[PDB]
Amino acid sequence: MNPIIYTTLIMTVMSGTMLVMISSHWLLIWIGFEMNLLAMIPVLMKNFNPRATEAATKYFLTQATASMMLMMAIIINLLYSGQWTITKMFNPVAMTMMTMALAMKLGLSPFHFWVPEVTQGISLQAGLLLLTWQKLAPLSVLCQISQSINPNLMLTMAMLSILIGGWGGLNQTQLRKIMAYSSIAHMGWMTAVLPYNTTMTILNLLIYITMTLAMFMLLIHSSATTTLSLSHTWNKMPVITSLMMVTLLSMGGLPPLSGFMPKWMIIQEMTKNESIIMPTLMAMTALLNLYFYMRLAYSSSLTMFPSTNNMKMKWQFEHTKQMKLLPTMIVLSTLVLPMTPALSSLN
Amino acid sequence: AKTLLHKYSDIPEGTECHRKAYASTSIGGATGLIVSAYSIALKPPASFLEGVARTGRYTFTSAAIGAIFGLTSCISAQVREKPDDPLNYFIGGCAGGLTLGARTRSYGIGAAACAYMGLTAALVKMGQLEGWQVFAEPKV
Amino acid sequence: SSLLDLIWLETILPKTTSFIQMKMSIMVSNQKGLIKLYFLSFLITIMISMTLFN
Amino acid sequence: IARTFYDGPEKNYEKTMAILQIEAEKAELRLKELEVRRLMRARGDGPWYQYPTIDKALIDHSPKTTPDN
Amino acid sequence: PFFDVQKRLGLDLDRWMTIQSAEQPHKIPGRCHAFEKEWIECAHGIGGIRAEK
Amino acid sequence: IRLQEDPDPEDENLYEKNPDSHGYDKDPIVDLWNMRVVFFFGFSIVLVLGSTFVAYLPDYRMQEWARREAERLVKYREANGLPLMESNCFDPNKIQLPE
Amino acid sequence: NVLQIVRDHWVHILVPVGFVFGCYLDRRSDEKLTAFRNKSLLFKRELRPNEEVTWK
Amino acid sequence: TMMSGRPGRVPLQFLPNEARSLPPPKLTDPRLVYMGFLGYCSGLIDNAIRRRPVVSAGLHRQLLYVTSFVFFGYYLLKRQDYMYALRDHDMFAYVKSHPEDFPEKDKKTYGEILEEFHPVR
Amino acid sequence: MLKIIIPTTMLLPMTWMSKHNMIWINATVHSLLISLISLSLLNQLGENSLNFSLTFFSDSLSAPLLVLTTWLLPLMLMASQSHLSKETTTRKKLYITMLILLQLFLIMTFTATELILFYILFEATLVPTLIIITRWGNQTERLNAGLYFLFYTLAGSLPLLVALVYIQNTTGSLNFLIIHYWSHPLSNSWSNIFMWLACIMAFMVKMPLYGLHLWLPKAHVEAPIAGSMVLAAVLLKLGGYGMMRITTILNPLTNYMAYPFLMLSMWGMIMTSSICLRQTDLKSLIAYSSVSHMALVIVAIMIQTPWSFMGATALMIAHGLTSSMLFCLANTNYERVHSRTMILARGLQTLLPLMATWWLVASLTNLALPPSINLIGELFIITASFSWSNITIILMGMNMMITALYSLYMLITTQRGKYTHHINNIKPSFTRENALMALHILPLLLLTLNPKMILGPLY
Ligand SMILES: CCCCCCCCCCCCCCCCCC(=O)OC[C@H](COP(=O)([O-])OCC(O)COP(=O)([O-])OC[C@@H](COC(=O)CCCCCCCCCCCCCCCCC)OC(=O)CCCCCCCCCCCCCCCCC)OC(=O)CCCCCCCCCCCCCCCCC
Numbered sequence A: 001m002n003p004i005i006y007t008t009l010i011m012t013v014m015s016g017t018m019l020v021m022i023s024s025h026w027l028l029i030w031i032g033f034e035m036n037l038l039a040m041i042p043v044l045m046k047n048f049n050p051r052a053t054e055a056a057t058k059y060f061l062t063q064a065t066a067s068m069m070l071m072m073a074i075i076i077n078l079l080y081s082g083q084w085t086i087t088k089m090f091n092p093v094a095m096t097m098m099t100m101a102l103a104m105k106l107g108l109s110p111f112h113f114w115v116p117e118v119t120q121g122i123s124l125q126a127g128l129l130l131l132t133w134q135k136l137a138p139l140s141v142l143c144q145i146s147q148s149i150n151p152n153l154m155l156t157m158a159m160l161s162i163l164i165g166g167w168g169g170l171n172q173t174q175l176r177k178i179m180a181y182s183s184i185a186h187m188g189w190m191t192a193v194l195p196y197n198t199t200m201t202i203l204n205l206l207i208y209i210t211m212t213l214a215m216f217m218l219l220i221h222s223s224a225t226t227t228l229s230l231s232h233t234w235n236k237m238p239v240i241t242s243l244m245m246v247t248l249l250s251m252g253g254l255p256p257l258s259g260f261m262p263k264w265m266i267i268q269e270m271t272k273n274e275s276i277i278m279p280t281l282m283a284m285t286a287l288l289n290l291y292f293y294m295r296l297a298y299s300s301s302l303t304m305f306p307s308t309n310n311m312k313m314k315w316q317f318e319h320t321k322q323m324k325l326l327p328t329m330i331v332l333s334t335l336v337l338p339m340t341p342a343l344s345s346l347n
Numbered sequence B: 001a002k003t004l005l006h007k008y009s010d011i012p013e014g015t016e017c018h019r020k021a022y023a024s025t026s027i028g029g030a031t032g033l034i035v036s037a038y039s040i041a042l043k044p045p046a047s048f049l050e051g052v053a054r055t056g057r058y059t060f061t062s063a064a065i066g067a068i069f070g071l072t073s074c075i076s077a078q079v080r081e082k083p084d085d086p087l088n089y090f091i092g093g094c095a096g097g098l099t100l101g102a103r104t105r106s107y108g109i110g111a112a113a114c115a116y117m118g119l120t121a122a123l124v125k126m127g128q129l130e131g132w133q134v135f136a137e138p139k140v
Numbered sequence C: 001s002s003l004l005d006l007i008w009l010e011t012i013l014p015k016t017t018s019f020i021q022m023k024m025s026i027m028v029s030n031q032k033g034l035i036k037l038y039f040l041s042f043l044i045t046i047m048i049s050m051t052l053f054n
Numbered sequence D: 001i002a003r004t005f006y007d008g009p010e011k012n013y014e015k016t017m018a019i020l021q022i023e024a025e026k027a028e029l030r031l032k033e034l035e036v037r038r039l040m041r042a043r044g045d046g047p048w049y050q051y052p053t054i055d056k057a058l059i060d061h062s063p064k065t066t067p068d069n
Numbered sequence E: 001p002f003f004d005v006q007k008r009l010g011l012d013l014d015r016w017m018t019i020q021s022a023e024q025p026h027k028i029p030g031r032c033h034a035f036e037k038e039w040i041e042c043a044h045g046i047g048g049i050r051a052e053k
Numbered sequence F: 001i002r003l004q005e006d007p008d009p010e011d012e013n014l015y016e017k018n019p020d021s022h023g024y025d026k027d028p029i030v031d032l033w034n035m036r037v038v039f040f041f042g043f044s045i046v047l048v049l050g051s052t053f054v055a056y057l058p059d060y061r062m063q064e065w066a067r068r069e070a071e072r073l074v075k076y077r078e079a080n081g082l083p084l085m086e087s088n089c090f091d092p093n094k095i096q097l098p099e
Numbered sequence G: 001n002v003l004q005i006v007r008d009h010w011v012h013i014l015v016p017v018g019f020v021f022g023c024y025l026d027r028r029s030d031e032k033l034t035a036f037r038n039k040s041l042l043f044k045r046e047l048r049p050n051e052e053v054t055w056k
Numbered sequence H: 001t002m003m004s005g006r007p008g009r010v011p012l013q014f015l016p017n018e019a020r021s022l023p024p025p026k027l028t029d030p031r032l033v034y035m036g037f038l039g040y041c042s043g044l045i046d047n048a049i050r051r052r053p054v055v056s057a058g059l060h061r062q063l064l065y066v067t068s069f070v071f072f073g074y075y076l077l078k079r080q081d082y083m084y085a086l087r088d089h090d091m092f093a094y095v096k097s098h099p100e101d102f103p104e105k106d107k108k109t110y111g112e113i114l115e116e117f118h119p120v121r
Numbered sequence I: 001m002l003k004i005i006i007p008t009t010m011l012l013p014m015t016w017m018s019k020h021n022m023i024w025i026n027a028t029v030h031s032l033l034i035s036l037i038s039l040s041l042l043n044q045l046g047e048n049s050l051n052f053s054l055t056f057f058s059d060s061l062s063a064p065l066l067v068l069t070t071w072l073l074p075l076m077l078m079a080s081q082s083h084l085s086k087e088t089t090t091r092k093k094l095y096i097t098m099l100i101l102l103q104l105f106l107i108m109t110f111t112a113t114e115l116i117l118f119y120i121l122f123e124a125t126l127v128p129t130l131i132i133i134t135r136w137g138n139q140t141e142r143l144n145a146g147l148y149f150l151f152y153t154l155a156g157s158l159p160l161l162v163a164l165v166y167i168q169n170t171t172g173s174l175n176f177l178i179i180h181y182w183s184h185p186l187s188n189s190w191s192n193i194f195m196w197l198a199c200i201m202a203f204m205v206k207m208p209l210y211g212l213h214l215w216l217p218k219a220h221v222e223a224p225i226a227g228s229m230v231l232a233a234v235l236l237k238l239g240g241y242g243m244m245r246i247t248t249i250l251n252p253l254t255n256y257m258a259y260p261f262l263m264l265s266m267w268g269m270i271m272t273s274s275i276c277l278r279q280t281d282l283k284s285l286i287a288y289s290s291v292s293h294m295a296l297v298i299v300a301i302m303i304q305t306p307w308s309f310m311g312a313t314a315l316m317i318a319h320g321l322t323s324s325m326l327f328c329l330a331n332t333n334y335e336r337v338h339s340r341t342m343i344l345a346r347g348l349q350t351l352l353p354l355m356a357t358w359w360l361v362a363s364l365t366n367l368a369l370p371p372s373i374n375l376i377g378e379l380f381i382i383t384a385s386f387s388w389s390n391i392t393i394i395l396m397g398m399n400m401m402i403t404a405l406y407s408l409y410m411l412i413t414t415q416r417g418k419y420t421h422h423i424n425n426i427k428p429s430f431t432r433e434n435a436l437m438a439l440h441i442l443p444l445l446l447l448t449l450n451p452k453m454i455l456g457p458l459y
């Protein structure tokens, strides 16, 4: 792929997402979704191999089905109201269709399998862009249409996402599948808080995006896609492993790190609405995510795995490409708990 | 599902134990049917007869658990003359757990299910008494 | 020491929970990666959301 | 020791009074804010939870093809 | 979520098409132009909750 | 063998190189000064000075003040025939019972 | 020489200056809680001729 | 969304004109100092990742880190203070304009209030 | 409190900027200076607490714990410099940084005035401890020990977070002064039962309670010496401090909800002493003795009388000092023979006399020997339990007998008898080890001399 073509495809993905986030018309929002998917497929297929082709095929099928359901919901809403503006939807059936379509686009359970499948299939840069941006857009649509969300359906899908992400991440050994299940669990948390505070949804989105960017860029720096490949990083550049360890501790929600702020604020907000069982279950279930984060931390930094002999040549050579904003993402993902009241600025 | 739950709740707590058992059996059968549908979808059977056998096994297990829970809880509350008491729901939940253990042929599964289901059913009764809500309506 | 501390206090709280989590993790992650299977799952989920949720 | 390292009891007493006043006022404000949020979300008659409606400046009032609009 | 670039910049990208009582070619009226006009003028400026109530 | 692994090193004795070792550092001067700073600061400064500071901490708990107030109250109450310990902490006139 | 001693033993002032700065910040925090100074019913009194505040 | 759609809100405005009447954060704000600390930590981590001397190398780069963090932190603090002041303004306005919803209550003393006593024995 | 907090945050850069061979010296000297500075917190008032600012306050309960933490840091530095001779400079500095962060978090925890900030800090204490255990532990089981410790603590503490945010929503504040002054009775309801359960269970897991304590032998046995010292001396006291703080708003529900916990504490105190009688590992014996003592502290806090709280505070301070000293002695023995088996090394009285003296004094303090503050606290708790009921005396007497039995069993097994013939690498005791033992033991005797400093606010 030509660099000009790649940058124009990235620009087109961002253009689709921005069209979704600036449009006041359902047709224009659907157009933005379609443009985003159309420019996103080749990004997945950039490094051509059967795994990448299969991941792109599964992603295309899922997103096409979601777009069909979304346009059906738009049409049904138009039939009963004659309105194209994105507001509270006027038909419960259309609202259910839209909720299911946006949940499928996000990867909320039980629409999650494509997330680990595609994330394993595609490279690290593709997975980073996929997770971050393709969560960025449908959450914007949901925040706009939150006041008509069915709380029962939204919270059911959110709790399912949390449980399934925890269990899948428990089982996986592949780093990309681990990141995908982490994404599923975090999306569950965000959509669980969504029907109450879109501000808390946005706060969790920002913190999750920062932590995910830091983790993916650390993986790209170490060029490790498996647990054992990451187990050799301590013998080449031990600083990256320590930074990954503190980022993993933050992503598990351990105080006083940045990952505790979204969980804390969401639990507080849901408690304000007389919800106790759901916050307690969500808090207890995240211990699975913390467990497999800790298991990954044991293999990479807290213990020394055996290495090989060509690692001496690797010692002799130095990393060339410089990650952009990696130190900033590492600092923002661990040390911004004292800056919590800025969510009012986020309001 | 809402209609079945409404029927079960509308039947009074300590009376009409046969109707309570029937309603709980219907709820359990619906849950088992949903579980069997998801199981067939995700892990396809080797044959139509094997799929029907799996569906029947799961549905009967769930329905038996529900019937035992309803019978035990209603009869316990009736004989003890203490409605609105979580102990009856705990006894029903442990009875359902023992039924699940018998169905799966495992003493350990039966004991763990008795403990967990009894605690869960006691918590459900306490929530009904105290006004706890799982999917709380937005406010504030 | 043995019967209570090393056996039953371990069996009740920490070991049983870990076993349940491992079993559920295996159950969730044990997928053959078949779009036919999980799209049938999608159809079931859509039908359930349409009917059982009002 | 008292002269060199410590102050009188009046300082601690009155600082405690000031701290208590601040914290009590904060608690009152928090409860009142919760009440205000509940009322505003239930009624929609304040500046909060004003979900957008359709602007009436978009309506075209010019005469149409048909007299009856 | 919604960055109202149209309102900020004074642009009109889809508001012309949002409703059926807006400016139509050749002044062709909608089927329910009067009813939509009445509802919009009722619900203008009071928010979704009060508009529905 | 399954790896190219180092042999487990022999235990290192600090007394072999330095017979008069305090067990702090391999370097003799560093070890001696570590001993000196630990002993001086810890024992002398912390133990002695903090112990005498705590012993001569001013009576901010008002134990002696309470004893003197009790002496005055006992003297006054036994001089006037009043009970030494009052029956109630507060004033029943200032307390308003429900009907 | 003398330069090396300062080059090596300059870290021995960090904790003392931190203690000094902590005392200063404690004074700063105390001076913000002076809204009931000489206003409690227990310790209220008239100021001496040559003082402005009861405590600092 | 609580304060989204508030009347008179200009879209895409980080700081409106009505925020100018609030006290700006001091330059010695502890929050600003913490933002500068975050910038310094980012510079140290950058040196560590690029395998330069962590404390000595790249003084200009570390200074730029600290300065950028302080700049964005000052503006972020201004916006946060404006939003909290706006929240308090709206709350007080609603309380004042709904007296029947927020009525004053007669204050009784503990000599009149009867509280049950639970002995600890 | 900033005059104590800032010097720790300055210990950090001093550690990272000192030379390679001066880190231990500088850290020890300045830790001792900070401890001396923190000795000024003991001057407390008889009416109320020391309210420095809106964020931090000190009390007759917080002051001894803060002094104990600040005194414990340099001893941990001495032990760590003992066992980390061959480490690299960067990793030595990282270990010192972990210790400094732990001390800072503990100080802020003990002085935090709000329950939510207290929760944040007392949960932040987990990360340095977990890193220390799972990174500088000697054996394979350190990973499992860290997992058990972390998950026990977090599964206990998350419902506490939910309860704290709920209480803030209900009452308007989590400030301790406000919740103490504005406290209202807790009616007998399922919701109040479960709120009480959330708070008490979090702190009980921290204690630990009997039946929730396996993580304690796991972590204490497998942690390095400094980690073992901090885990027993201070980190076990966060649960007791929290219970003595939260129980303000949990009345009168504590009269009825405390029965299962009291029964568990008493019976498990007996059971853990009996377990100590039959331990083939010295560290495990010390850990189970810690469990028994903290069970007694739980009994005191649950019976919740002014005589019980003073005993609880005194016993917490005494247990911290004694358990730290016992762990240090066992670690010196381990550094000799590279094994934790109790019966491996014998005749250590004829091989090392002054260490035998230190063992004797530590064991005599471990059992309640008058007039030690250990006995003061235990006797106050026993008297309060006697006023509570008159069979608690039977249980306490059984526990005291078994405590003396296993303490003297450990002493006789390790020190008396004839030495192992084939162990010929037991070098004479170091000045550093002797100074560590002396600094462990002398403050305990001075506290015995002046006992009102550790009897808490109820004195
Ligand atoms: C200073 C206290 C900080 C407290 C925390 C604050 C937040 C974090 C600090 C910001 C980031 C700092 C830099 C990080 C990378 C450091 C790399 C390194 O080697 O550094 C050595 C470096 C000197 O060595 P070098 O010659 O440049 O290069 C040697 C090679 O780097 C030699 O490298 P190597 O090849 O030997 O690398 C191997 C090593 C590589 O290991 C590392 O690089 C460790 C550091 C990176 C890990 C992550 C750091 C934290 C990032 C944020 C996460 C949250 C932090 C808070 C967490 C709280 C809960 C735990 O890996 C291992 O040893 C693996 C085994 C250990 C793994 C398990 C333990 C992991 C612990 C993770 C948490 C650590 C928290 C504290 C970190 C303190 C770092 C100084 O010293 C420093 O960087 C010291 C810090 C800066 C001091 C500035 C002083 C300025 C002048 C005085 C100012 C006085 C106050 C001002 C006011 C006015 C007074 C008058």
Ligand SMILES: CCCCCCCCCCCCCCCCC[C@@H](O)O[C@H](CO[C@H](O)CCCCCCCCCCCCCCC)COP(=O)(O)OCC[N+](C)(C)C
Residues within 6 Å of the ligand: A206, A336, A339, A340, A341, A342, A343, A345, A346, A347, E001, E002, E003, E004, H004, H010, H011, H012, H013, H014, H015, H076
């Ligand atoms: C007239 C000539 C002078 C004009 C001056 C320019 C006027 C302002 C121009 C603003 C830039 C031009 C537009 C560029 C995009 C605008 C982005 C921003 O300005 O908009 C604001 C948005 O500001 C950002 O949201 C605040 C950024 C806060 C970043 C931190 C988040 C808090 C994290 C908590 C932890 C903090 C850790 C420390 C961080 C370093 C509000 O816009 P709004 O239309 O209403 O948003 C709608 C969506 N809502 C309602 C749901 C919010």
